[PDB]
């Protein structure tokens, strides 16, 4: 279902790894010429996609990830990684492998993986 960005019962914090996810991973991807389709939730009205929200049941976007980081919603950097992988997986599910949006997602995913690989230990 659509994703919350705060939850009073859910433990939340900002570790050194979560700070790295915000200040290095998200911020690097944000300043990329191909990031703009991912700043906000997919807009099925503007794109005229009657089936998007029938097929994609766990939507995710980088704006939601940013808000989760800003709210100290996560407990672990692994949860932030989860959200990025949901974002990419959804794009690859819904779109055809040759579409412009998939090529853009693949370029961002390559940078995501490089920055995660250089994340420091907790």
């Amino acid at each position: 279902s659509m994703p919350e960005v705060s939850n009073p019962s859910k433990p939340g914090r900002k570790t050194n790894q979560l700070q790295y996810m915000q200040n290095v991973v998200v911020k690097t991807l944000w300043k990329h010429q191909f990031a703009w389709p991912f700043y906000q939730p997919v807009d099925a009205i503007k794109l005229n996609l009657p089936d998007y929200h029938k097929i994609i049941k766990n939507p995710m976007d980088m704006g939601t990830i940013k808000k989760r980081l800003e709210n100290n919603y996560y407990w672990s950097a692994s949860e932030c990684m989860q959200d990025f992988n949901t974002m990419f997986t959804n794009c690859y599910i819904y779109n055809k492998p040759t579409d412009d949006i998939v090529l853009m997602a693949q370029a961002l995913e390559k940078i995501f993986l490089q920055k995660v690989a250089q994340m420091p230990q907790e």
């Binding site: 010429q33 389709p37 794109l47 996609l49 579409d99 412009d100 949006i101 853009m104």
Partner: peptide, 6 residues
């Protein structure tokens, strides 16, 4: 089906 993008 999102079409052409830059």
């Amino acid at each position: 089906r999102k079409g052409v993008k830059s």
